Structures are given as structure tokens and as C-alpha cells.
Symmetry: D2
Subunit: 291 residues, 4 copies
Amino acid sequence: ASIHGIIGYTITPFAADGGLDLPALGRSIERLIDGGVHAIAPLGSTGEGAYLSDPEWDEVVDFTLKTVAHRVPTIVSVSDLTTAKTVRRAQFAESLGAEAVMVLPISYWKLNEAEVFQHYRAVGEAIGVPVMLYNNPGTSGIDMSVELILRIVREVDNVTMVKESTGDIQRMHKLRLLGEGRVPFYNGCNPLALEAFVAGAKGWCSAAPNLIPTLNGQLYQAVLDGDLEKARALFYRQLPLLDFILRRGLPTTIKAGLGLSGLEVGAPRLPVQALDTEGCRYLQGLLEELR
Amino acid sequence: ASIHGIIGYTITPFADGGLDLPALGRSIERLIDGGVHAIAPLGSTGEGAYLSDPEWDEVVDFTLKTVAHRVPTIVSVSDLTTAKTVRRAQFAESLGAEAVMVLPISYWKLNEAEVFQHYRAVGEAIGVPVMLYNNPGTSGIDMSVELILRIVREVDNVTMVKESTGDIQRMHKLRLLGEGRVPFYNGCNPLALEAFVAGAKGWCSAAPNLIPTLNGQLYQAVLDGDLEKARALFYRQLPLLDFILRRGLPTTIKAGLGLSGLEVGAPRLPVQALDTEGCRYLQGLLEELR
Amino acid sequence: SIHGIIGYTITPFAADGGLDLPALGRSIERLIDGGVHAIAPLGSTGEGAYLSDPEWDEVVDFTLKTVAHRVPTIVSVSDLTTAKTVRRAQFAESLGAEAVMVLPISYWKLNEAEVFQHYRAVGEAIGVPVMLYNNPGTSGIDMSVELILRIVREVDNVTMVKESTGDIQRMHKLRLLGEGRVPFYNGCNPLALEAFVAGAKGWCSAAPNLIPTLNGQLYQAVLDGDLEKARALFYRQLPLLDFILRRGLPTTIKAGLGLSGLEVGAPRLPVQALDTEGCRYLQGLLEELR
Amino acid sequence: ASIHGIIGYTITPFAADGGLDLPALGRSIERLIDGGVHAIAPLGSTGEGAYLSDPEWDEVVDFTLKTVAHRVPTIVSVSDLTTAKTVRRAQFAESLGAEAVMVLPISYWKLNEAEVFQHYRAVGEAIGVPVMLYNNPGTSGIDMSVELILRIVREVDNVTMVKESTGDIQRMHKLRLLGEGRVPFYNGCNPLALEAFVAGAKGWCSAAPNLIPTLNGQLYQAVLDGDLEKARALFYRQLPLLDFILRRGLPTTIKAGLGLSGLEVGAPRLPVQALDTEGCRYLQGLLEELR
Ligand SMILES: [Mg+2]
Ligand SMILES: [Mg+2]
Ligand SMILES: [Mg+2]
Ligand SMILES: [Mg+2]
């Protein structure tokens, strides 16, 4: 079950009572699979995973995996503050059929390289499925060097993949060189989708497939076809929307976008606010011109 | 009761992995005996974020009971969701907290409107003062002085501001733009001296766990307006403050307490206990202070 | 027309430390034989800022004469004052320069209004195109895309934009906001591949002094739309591009030419010549690419 | 003669015809001395040193030293791109009686620690007067660690003083601790004037004395008197002006300020522009408030 191409981040719809709206989540999942995504990645920032209580988190994982029905690989974000809880969530995700889990070293205080390494070792040694190492300083507060990342990949059996969202293309260049092309890496930063693929990215994790699965998939196809000129055209066409998502927030824009697409998924959980009227109209236009 | 001077951050001892409340009680007594003007539980020092909800609730209750209002207690109630932050603020208040501290935590940027409303929600839910805490290094959110002042003036219960950016200019602005009416507090150890001279009303630190005497003397020297003694006292303790910063609060404080006759275990993974080499260096720093 | 591989020239010095024009001539011949599409003299690579006014004037003259218009020449006339920048731009034009490049160098921040008039003054003072060059790392000034676009659209002679921030997003924005009308060039070696794919019309580099073949091949592959071949070619030469940036342009390029049978001396102090270790590593890198 | 207290940066007035206005420069120097500065520092950023031709630079040095008539020490900024020219300027300054020189490692291209050390070594060994090592990454593009600075100071005889303009008070803490209080350091960052003195700075180099020498001097005196309360008050009273100078630029605000103070000194050299009407209005208000 190769993990590649367009990997769709799922959102977490909330019901009026503020609780989970699973039915809506199932529809969004079906919308993604039919949109032609190559995998599903639940409980990331897009899904406001960190806003969920433990019961809610468990329920979302369960429902998502049951819904997907192994039609495409599922990579669950199991990142948490403590090693114990990260391990526990990784084991839980595996027990329900997750093909892989993603681990970002989130922390409020700085972690040293030894502490980061052991964190990944503990998670990998506790499970039987692959772990995707996720480097995102902007959100986690930690910035792992390519050297450290490569040591974790080599020394930790289950750590096999690397996602980069630093926005710094040089990180992927170093991964390619120092990894000698044997360490598969993935793109996590939307505005760099084109460059990421050109640099050799095996896949692109994004919430955009929630709104424009077709354009996203065409970009990946163009790269596979080695069509440099077409890929550029496709990228610049969808870039504005990509910039807007980063600009106004993932869950904020995605949930609003799905709402405009006739799919009621409610609003984000406070303190995150729903897209305002002005932003909603602008998004409306962006989507109409892309369609 | 005025919140001022030396405000001691408590650590959270762990036993078997669970809480070691008896050890916590002992550490709290030390701090109060040590002359702290207030207690601040469940901050970064106390690894608050590593605690389960049940553990957090337990620590809050136990801490408040132990202190027994001998000094003011300001509880860190910050959490990701507004709903949870509000709940923790009300919980702390109901259990006797004199004040609460709120830091806008988020694994993704929040806009000024989202931040402002976050504080408004918390302030309106309680009847005790809120200390607004700006620490982008640990929170990922950096609030401008202008925004901070808007929150202080518009939200009744938000009355105090803690700065931990390490950027003294933030305090200068708070001083000028707030026209000296907005009390601010220092949360950055290596800036203790400058913060006080800039007008800081208090200093929130975990250092009192190890050197409560030098900490208190620095504050007193400032109160006495004795610039030269203050400078001397600060530089004498600076090396230790620098070390705490480089090697981590919970890591260094828990290690240091072990050297001071108080076993409090190790930090919670992925944070690791101070290594042998670091521990030896710490022993040297404390000796030299002596 | 400026496109493809624009080769930055170095400025050879004799043992004494003075100009070595013969060697410069040989290096220019190596570049043109190498297949460069343009020559860019007196940039950072050429240690332009290190030259006296007389030395600078002579290098420009000798360069333009040696080239004999076989390929376009774009002279870097950037200087601190507007008056001297204008003078240098006119001197270059009077000697046949096809165009000039202007970077807003300053030892103190300049405001957007000051930057704009600087370019306006230069543009209105000459009759050849001006390439606006944004390089914060080497200038101390970072021009916004909107500012750059405002200068290009309002200043007749300002027609081209060079980006050296290493931030691909700047080029994306130049593409969208410029609507594909504003031709931009890459000035950052390790971004050659991405820059071309993003829409870069040319790549100004000192690398052509060492590996003009691999350089041109990368450009040609992009012209053909061969994404895979381009990637392979880029990564093959990247190690060298990384080394140059890490050890210094003039330092590595002068050491490289030495190992390429073209003695060009060392950099002008305080810049030091490549050391033994770095020299052996560069030697290994080159032998592998050839 | 000790270099301490308030060291006044001079501006370089230009005549209507673009050339040097020596009479105006003389008047500004007298104003500084009468204002109670403890030293004069010509040809820094305040004086637009880098904007001057060689003949102009030489003349300003000559005229300045003659005007001062050794009433107070003069520390000339001799920093230049090449080691050769920096040495020449240092020697020229000394030949005309300069008490000391200041050296900042200017470089468009980055420089390594070895290159920086040798630069100072060359300058120090070429002259017979003290050198003030000046760290200002914001201007030079180079950021010398305190460790490197202390090595230079210890190993190069004539390098005896350190000026810090990073705005990072911790650098001064390190200089005091690692230097064991035997390496005199100076403040070059206006809005850090109070903290620098509190940290133990021996002197403060500023262009502010051109406008408010009295308040500048009073702050220093309060620090000497150990009066924490008064020092704080004096600093905050003048901070708005210090903030403004930094925000609007040295030559710009200083030359505009002197004009508002009855001393016509022309405008800065392009690309630097004169203070705008709105700025002049604000500045006039600040000065009237302080006087
Ligand atoms: Mg592995
Ligand atoms: Mg209030
Ligand atoms: Mg134009
Ligand atoms: Mg010395």
C-alpha cells in the first residue's frame, strides 16, 4: 500500500450541540475518495485534532478508519505532548487498521536532539506500522535538522518517511542528497507544492483536496508525466486558493469552503472563529473561477 | 492581596509515574519559608501541559489547600480551547485561587480578533483577576503591546501583564503606552535586573526553588533603589539563571532540588532528567553561589 | 536579450594585490567558450565593492572591450549614494554596456520612498535597461514584491527583477501579481532548479566559471520541459553550488579556477583564500563533475 | 583620557552646493561640548561617513579634531570594507591627534571568525592608539559572538574597548561575566540606554546629545549616583525621542532636529531623504515637550 500522490487532510465537523457530526465526516471522506485522493490523513491541524477530547479523538479515528474501509491508505496523526500518550495513540490507531501514523514533536519548551530521538524511538518500537516523521517548526515549536531526521530514519526501524513543512526547499534538497534518494519525503506546505514535486517529493499532504481535488490531482499527474510546463500552469491557477487557505486558516477556510459546496460541516471550535462574511465572498469567487 | 515581588513557580513531582503530592507539599513549604510573595502552579516549570485533566485538577486543589492563603496563588489555566480555558479558570476560582494566568496556546496562529475574544470569554466567566501572559517562545503566539493594552482596558478582569519574550522594549512600551497604570511582570530569568529597573512589579521564577535568598535580595535591592547592589546581586546569580534556561526548567529545577535535600523525581518524557555532566556543573554553580 | 546562464566574473589580483587584466581576459574567454548567454561584471563575485574608483572604472572598460558584444553585458553599478550610482550607471552605458544592475546597498535601513526615488534617479539618468536586484543578505534592504512591481511599472528603464532571497514565494508573487509580464531572474544558486520551474528567465551565477557545461545543460533541460532530466542535472551539481555558498563566492571561485589551470590570485583582505582542507574538497568535487 | 559617559555622534552638514559646510559642523561640535558630552565620535552612521568621498572624509577628520582642540577625547570611525583602507584611515586619524578609533567589520559578503580576527589584528598592529571594537550586525551584516570579541580584545593589544548595538542586553551580560568585569563595554543602541548603564556600560555613544544633551547627561549622572528611581524617570522622559530617531533614521532626524533648534545643517545625502512635514511637526512637538 504505497503512500504517495495527493494525501487529503480531513476536517472534523461539529454538530450544533458542539459535539461530533460523524455523518458529515463520512460524507467529506466520500467526497475526498471520489475526488481521487491517494490516501487519507485524519486528525491533523486541518481536523483540529488538538481541540478534541480523548473520547472524541478515539471516536474520530475509529469512524474514519471504518469509513475508509482500506480503500486507500490512512495515515493518522498521533502526535501529543507526552511520549506515553503519543505511544498510546499510535498503538490505538494501529489496532484499528491504520496503515501508518504521523508524529510531530510538539512541545511548549525546547527539546534537545537526544530527547527528540528517544521520542521517535519509543513510538516506533511500540508499534508494527510505519511512522512518518513530521517536521513543522511553525506549529510544533521544534525544528529538526536533516541530519537528525536521517539518523532517526536509519536507526529507528519503523520511521520510514519524512514530511517537510518548513517552507524551505533546501531541506528537501538535503534529504535527497544526504539520503541518496533512498529516503522518501513528502510536502506539507501548500504554496510549495510545485517546487516540492520537482525536488522529488513522493506525495503532498493537503486540505485543498476538500475543495479542489481535481486540480490537485492534475498537478501530481503532470509531474508524473514530467510535463514541466503544464505543471507550472496548473500550480499558478490553484495557488491563489492555496495562499488564501494559509492566509485565513485551515479549518476556517476548509469548513467554509465545504459549506459553500453544499456540505454542512459547521464552524471551528473557539478560539478559532468561522470565516467572516467578507472572506466568505472572496472564497466563493476563488472557487467559482477554479470551477 | 497584592501580587508582587518574587512569585515562585512550583514543579510537579512524580513518583511509579503518578503524582507525588507529599513531595509537592514539601516544595511549597520551602518556597513559602523561602520568602516568596506568591505561588504560581502549573506553568512550564510544573509541566502543566504534560498532566492529564485529572492530574491537573488534583494539583490545583492540593496546591491551594497547602498554601492556605498564606500568600496569593495565581494558577495557570491556559489551554487550547476557550471552553476548557474557561472551565479551568472557574475551577481554580471555586477552589480559592486569588488569580489566574492565561497564555494563548495554539498549534496554529490565531488572529488578533480570536485572541481578544479568548480573553474576553475567560474574564467574563470569573470574578478574580486575570494575568495576561505573552510568551511566543512557548505559546507560538506573539501579542503586540497595542493588542495587550486593548485587552487590559476592554476586559475588566484582565488587569496584569507578564512578559517573557526577553525583549525589554516590550516593557518600555507597556510603560509608556500604559502611562504607568498597567502593572507588568517579568517571566524571563536572565532579564530579571533590567525588568525590575524598567518598572516590573514582580518576577515570576522557578529559581526560588534553589536560591530564594539571592532572588529576594535582588528584589529588595530594587525596592531600596540601590542600583549598584542590585547589579551585583544579579550578576552573582546570573550564571545559574542562564543554566536553567539552556538546560530546561523542570530538568534543572528537579535536579537542583535533589541536591538540596528534596527528591522530586524526573521530568515526564520526552523531557529527560539532567545528565550526570549537567548535574555536576549545576553542583558547581550552586556551590559558587554560596 | 538577457536570458539563460548569466556568468558572474571574478576580479583577478596579482601577487601584489593589484588588478590582473590578462587573467580576467582569460576567465572571460573561458565563460563565453563555456556557453554563457551573458556576462555580469563587478558583482559580489567580482569583489566590486572592494575596488577603488580607478580600479572599478578599468575593470568595466577592459570587460566590455574583451567581450566585444559577443554576449550582452550587465554591469553592477550599485553604490551607496544616488549620485555615485548614477555616475557609474552612465559610465557603464557610455562604454557600451547593454544594461546595468542596481542593488540598494546601505549601511542603514532606507524607507520605501527613498528606495523608489533611488531607482527613478538611476533609470531616468540612462538609456539602457535596469535590472532591479533584491538581496537583503548582501544589501541590508529587503524590497517587497509590491514595491518592486511599483518601481518596474513607474520607472521606464527598470524592466527586470533579480531575486536572491532564496524565497521561492517571492517569484510566485512576481508571477501572479506581475501577471507573467515582469521577467524575473534567479540569483540564488541552490534554488536554480526551482527558480527555472517557477518561471525564471535566467540564472545569474558565478558557477559557470567552474562548471559552465552542467549549468547550461540544466537550462536547456528546462527549455525542453524535461522535468526529470532537469532534476538529475541539478542534484548532480548541487554539492558544488552548496560549497560555493558555504565557503564564499570569490574565495571558492578563485580557488576553483586555480585548480582549473587559470591562476587568478586570492580575494582582497579581509577575505582570505580557500584553505588547504577546503581546497582538497573542492578539487574532489570538480574532478567528479568533469 | 578616559572614554566614558555621553559620547556624542556628530553629523556631517552639507552646503547648499552639496559640499561640506564646515562652519555649520563647527557650530554643532560646540553645541555638543557646551552640552556636556564627555567625548566626540565623528564619521559614524550619524555623520553619513560612508557617503563621503575620500577628500571629504579626510577634511572632516582634520576639521573635527582641530575644532575639539582636545577639550574631550575624539574617537574616529575608520571602518571600511577592505583591511587596507581601514588601516590607512586609522593611521590618518591617529596622525591628526585622534585619541582612539572605532572599527566595525563591514562586509557585503559574509566573513568568518578567522577573517574577522585578522582584520582587527592588522588595524591594531598598524597604529599606536586604542581601538574600539564595534558590533552592529544590523549595519555591518556581521554578528561577532562575545567569545570572539573577548579573544580579539585579549590577543590584540590595541583593541581595548567594546561597543554593542545588537539591542540584546544579554550580550553585555556575557561581556561582564565572561570578561570578569575587566573589559569595558559601551552602549550604541539608544532605546537600551537605561538597561545598558544598569548592566554596567561605561559609556553611551549617541546622536541624541545633538538635541537633548542635558537629559542624556542627567541619565548618566543618575546612574553614577546609583539613583535607580531617577534614572528610570529620566530615561522614560526621553525615550519617545530616542524611539523616533531610531524609527526615522539618524541623519534624517538629527539634521531636522538641529534645524528646529536654530542650527541650519541642511539635509542628508540621497538616497536618504530629509524629514517630511508630518515628521517635522511631530519632532517639533517632542523637542518642545522636552525643553
Ligand atoms: Mg527506519
Ligand atoms: Mg482590565
Ligand atoms: Mg519599467
Ligand atoms: Mg587588547
